[PDB]
Write an enzyme that holds these catalytic residues in place. Structure first.
Site, short mmCIF file in Angstrom:
data_model
loop_
_atom_site.label_atom_id
_atom_site.label_comp_id
_atom_site.label_asym_id
_atom_site.label_seq_id
_atom_site.Cartn_x
_atom_site.Cartn_y
_atom_site.Cartn_z
N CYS A 120 37.55 31.70 49.37
CA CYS A 120 36.16 31.89 49.77
C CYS A 120 36.09 33.04 50.76
CB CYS A 120 35.63 30.61 50.43
SG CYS A 120 33.79 30.66 50.89
N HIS A 163 30.33 27.61 42.59
CA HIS A 163 30.75 27.92 43.97
C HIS A 163 29.56 28.41 44.81
CE1 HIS A 163 34.13 29.53 46.67
NE2 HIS A 163 33.05 30.09 47.18
N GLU A 164 28.77 29.34 44.27
CA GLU A 164 27.66 29.86 45.10
C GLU A 164 26.58 28.80 45.32
OE1 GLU A 164 28.67 32.35 46.50
OE2 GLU A 164 30.12 32.97 44.95
N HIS A 167 27.41 26.70 48.15
CA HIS A 167 27.04 27.33 49.44
C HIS A 167 25.60 27.02 49.86
CE1 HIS A 167 30.76 29.17 50.79
NE2 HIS A 167 30.91 30.03 49.80
O1 LIG Z 1 30.97 32.65 47.94
C1 LIG Z 1 31.57 33.51 47.31
N1 LIG Z 1 32.81 33.86 47.67
O2 LIG Z 1 33.33 33.06 48.71
C2 LIG Z 1 33.65 34.81 47.05
C3 LIG Z 1 34.60 34.19 46.05
C4 LIG Z 1 33.74 33.53 44.93
C5 LIG Z 1 34.67 32.86 43.96
C6 LIG Z 1 35.81 32.01 44.36
C7 LIG Z 1 36.36 31.55 42.99
C8 LIG Z 1 35.17 31.51 42.04
C9 LIG Z 1 34.00 32.12 42.79
C10 LIG Z 1 35.44 35.36 45.66
O3 LIG Z 1 35.07 36.31 44.99
N2 LIG Z 1 36.72 35.32 46.19
C11 LIG Z 1 37.10 34.35 47.18
C12 LIG Z 1 38.42 34.91 47.67
C13 LIG Z 1 38.74 36.20 46.96
C14 LIG Z 1 37.53 36.50 46.09
C15 LIG Z 1 37.93 36.62 44.64
O4 LIG Z 1 38.26 35.67 43.95
N3 LIG Z 1 37.84 37.91 44.20
C16 LIG Z 1 38.08 38.27 42.90
O5 LIG Z 1 38.16 37.51 41.96
C17 LIG Z 1 38.07 39.72 42.73
C18 LIG Z 1 38.61 40.55 43.71
C19 LIG Z 1 38.56 41.91 43.48
C20 LIG Z 1 37.98 42.40 42.32
C21 LIG Z 1 37.44 41.55 41.36
C22 LIG Z 1 37.51 40.19 41.56
NI NI Z 2 32.40 31.27 48.97
#
Ligand SMILES: O=CN(O)C[C@@H](CC1CCCC1)C(=O)N1CCC[C@H]1C(=O)NC(=O)c1ccccc1
Ligand code: NI
Length: 192
Positions: A120, A163-164, A167
């Site tokens: 996250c 996930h969103e 939130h």
């Molecule tokens: O509330 C929303 N967030 O917390 C962001 C989350 C959302 C997802 C978490 C798992 C399903 C939804 C999120 O993107 N990541 C959390 C940690 C790293 C990053 C992540 O997985 N990046 C990538 O896949 C990524 C990174 C770089 C390029 C493309 C994709």
């Molecule tokens: Ni998140």
């Protein structure tokens, strides 16, 4: 106010705007927006989408110090409104949406979890384990013009939107891990 500050024309959202666990806004249930939207609410949704695109752009992510992300919810900006942005790249984009008042209106009995687990942007540590979600969801939301959309998601895109939406209800991904056996697979759980 966080919304007045973030929606200034000169402001690019970056990691300094994203609040982390311990801030109570992440545990609060966010408020519905009303239509028509204010300019600020439209701009906020656009700025969140720009953040995601910048975070996935390696040149811009490097210059801004961003963690790449596929989703963002307004409570992660300390703004308690039910507004989310999702941007899932194709392997341009498989899913790109700014959603106002998103709601799960139908879900499968089958559950699903990412086999890599989840992190996250609001969580500066790792929490291993399967985050147990619905496998398929039907989601209603409104766009910036107030028009209603109803979409069906499965696979990874279903996990991201879930996930969103967690939130905007004050839920963190590790709330969905079974801490007693984090890698447990009950009948009806599909590991993606
Ligand atoms: O509330 C929303 N967030 O917390 C962001 C989350 C959302 C997802 C978490 C798992 C399903 C939804 C999120 O993107 N990541 C959390 C940690 C790293 C990053 C992540 O997985 N990046 C990538 O896949 C990524 C990174 C770089 C390029 C493309 C994709
Ligand atoms: Ni998140």
């Amino acid at each position: 106010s966080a919304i007045e500050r973030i929606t200034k024309a000169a402001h690019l959202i970056d990691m300094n705007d994203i609040i982390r666990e311990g801030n109570p806004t992440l545990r609060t249930v966010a408020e519905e927006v009303t239509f028509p939207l204010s300019d600020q609410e439209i701009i906020l949704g656009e700025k969140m989408m720009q953040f995601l695109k910048h975070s996935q752009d390696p040149v811009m992510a490097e210059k801004m110090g961003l963690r790449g992300g596929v989703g963002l919810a307004a409570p992660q900006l300390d703004i308690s409104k039910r507004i989310i942005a999702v941007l899932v790249p194709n392997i341009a984009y498989d899913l790109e949406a700014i959603m106002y008042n998103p709601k799960i209106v139908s879900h499968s009995v089958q559950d699903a979890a990412l086999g890599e687990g989840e992190g996250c942007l609001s969580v500066d540590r790792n929490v291993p384990g399967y985050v147990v979600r619905h496998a398929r969801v039907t989601v209603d939301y409104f766009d910036k013009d107030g028009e209603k959309h109803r979409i069906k998601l499965k696979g990874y895109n279903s996990i991201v939107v879930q996930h969103e939406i967690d939130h905007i209800n004050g839920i963190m991904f590790y709330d969905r891990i079974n801490e007693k056996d984090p890698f447990a697979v009950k009948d009806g759980l599909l590991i993606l």
